[PDB]
Structures are given as structure tokens and as C-alpha cells.
From a paper:
Unlike other PLs, Smlt1473 present in the clinically relevant Stenotrophomonas maltophilia strain K279a demonstrates a wide range of pH-dependent substrate specificities toward multiple, diverse polysaccharides: hyaluronic acid (pH 5.0), poly-β-D-glucuronic (celluronic) acid (pH 7.0), poly-β-D-mannuronic acid, and poly-α-L-guluronate (pH 9.0). To decode the pH-driven multiple substrate specificities and selectivity in this single enzyme, we present the X-ray structures of Smlt1473 determined at multiple pH values in apo and mannuronate-bound states as well as the tetra-hyaluronate-docked structure. We have built and refined the structures from residues A22-L330; electron density for other residues outside this range was either weak or absent. The structure is composed of 13 α-helical segments (α-1 to α-13) connected by 14 loops (L-1 to L-14) and two β-strands (β-1 and β-2) (Fig. 2, B and C (i and ii)).
In order to visualize and understand the effects of pH on Smlt1473 structure, we have crystallized and determined the protein structure at different pH values (5.0, 5.5, 6.5, 7.0, 8.5, and 9.0). The atomic superposition of all the crystal structures across the entire range of pH values did not show any significant change as a function of pH. However, significant rotameric transitions of important substrate-binding residues such as K42, K162, R163, H221, and R312L have been observed at different pH values. At the entry site, the residues involved in rotameric transition are H221 and R312, of which H221 has an altered orientation in all structures above pH 5.0, whereas R312 has an altered orientation only in the pH 7.0 structure due to a hydrogen bonding interaction with Y225. At the exit site, K42 exhibits an altered orientation only in the pH 6.5 and 9.0 structures, whereas in pH 5.0 and pH 5.5 there is no change in orientation; interestingly, at pH 7.0 and 8.5 a lack of electron density precluded analysis of the residue orientation. For K162, the altered orientation was observed only for the pH 6.5 and 9.0 structures; for pH 7.0 and pH 8.5 a lack of electron density precluded analysis of residue orientation.
Author numbering: 23 to 329
The structure:
Amino acid sequence: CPAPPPGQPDIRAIGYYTDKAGSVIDPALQQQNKDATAPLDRYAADVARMSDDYLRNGDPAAAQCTLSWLGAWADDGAMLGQMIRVNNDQSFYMRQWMLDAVAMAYLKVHDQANPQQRARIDPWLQKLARANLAYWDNPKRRRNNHYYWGGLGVLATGLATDDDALWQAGHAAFQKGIDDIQDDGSLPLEMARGQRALHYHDYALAPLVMMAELARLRGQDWYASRNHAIDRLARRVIEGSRDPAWFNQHTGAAQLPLQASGWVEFYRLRSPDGGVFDAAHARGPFHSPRLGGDLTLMATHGIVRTP
């Protein structure tokens, strides 16, 4: 088990879109952001990977090393300080994505946590979750896909730490996202993203799918909400992956090509839909730390090894 890097209480991230539609990447701003957030993304990949190794192998050294890394950053009060604003709220967005990765990683190795590790990690995740919720109480921040990503970490913290209040807030974010699904399966706030509208429909669906998957650990069927409305979005996304024709004729910008993200590994098992997800499934792999790590592995073996 390698030594964890030091936990920084402050986040200093930088947005890299040039335009209003948040779709034209400034490659200078993107590199500046990637360097400034490199240790955060590096930590998220690591706890995702190690918690992957535990679910894959049963190996208790992978669980302990995950818990050791999480406890260290809890002790450091990592990300519990200043969210530095340069040009946008990219720092608040990183705090949502980082809670997502660390909470999901904590959930996957939680059965191996002793009461002393829990007493250190639980309050740290609960403070990040409350801070991520309180970010949205400002009525002038529009609740797009960021809100759905925010909800995933709050829900996983609510479930990991047995906090029913953070669990209900997680559901509230998921329900908001499901209620955004239009007749055509589009999301208005994601349709406004120009050449990345199709990207941001896949990007919005993934945390909704993972939140429905967490509710399934507790035996609830969130997929069924609003007469399976989520199926219209997942269905609209998988067809954009194949043929971007519908999206280009509704957006006023030629879509960049999209390979579906790893929500397909879970969703193909819940609503097979005659095998429309088969092509995406066969063209992985599907690793995203901010969604919990190895989505292929968690889809076939379970998000947790015991309830």
C-alpha cells in the first residue's frame, strides 16, 4: 500500500470553454486546468482503481489501502476549504466530481471498514455532501448535468454513511433530472451546448443511471419513475451514438462524434430494449473514477460485495 499524497483543503480549477454554449475548448485554458487539478484526478483514479481491485479479487489489502487513502484525506480535511473562482465555478464542479469518486470508492470497500475508519471518513464525506448541496441553494445557478453529478456523491454518501437526509437529497437531484426529460428524450439545458449537446446528454444520463443503481442496492426501482421516462433519454443517447442526425437538426451545430459512456453496462441489464446497447457494450473498456471506477466490473459483479 503506497503512501497517500497530502490532502489539500483548497481547489483551484479553471473552465476552458470560449463561448456561451460551453462547447468550444480553449486548449490553453484546458491544459492550465488539467495541470491545476492533476493531483485531484490522480487521487480519484487511484481510490477508484484500488476499490476496483477489491470487488474484482476479494483482496482485503486493496480494501484496506483504499480505506487508508480515504482516511488520510479525511484527516487532512481535503477539499473542505476555499473553492477558488477564476473565470467560472470549475472548483465547485471538481468538488462534486471528487465527492462522487471518493464516496463511490468508500461504498465499494465499506464492508471492510472498522468503526475507527468509519468515524474518520463518514464526517468528511458528510461535510463535502452538505457543501455540495448548499452550492445549489443560490437560485441563479441553473441545475443542468452538474446538478445530477452533484446528486450522485450526496446519494452515495447518504448510503455509505447511513444518513437518510443526504439519501433524500440525492433522490431529489435524481428526480429533478428525470423530470427534465422531455417528450423527445432531450434535456433543454443540455440541448443548448452546441456541438457538445449529444456529449452532454450521455454526460447527464450517466450519473442518473448510477443513482438508480444505488437505489437498487436498497431495493428501490427508480428506473420506473415517470413511467420509465429515463428510457427516453438513454434511448435518445444510444441513437445519437449511432446516428447523430436527430441532434444536428435540433441544435444549430454539427455534433462531435460520441461513444456512449459506461452507463450502458448497467442499463443494458435493466431495460434490454431488444439489444440497442450491444454495440456500445462490445466497445469498452468503461473506467470513469467519478462514476465509481470500473463500470463493466460493477455491472457484472455488483457495486458492493455485501448489502
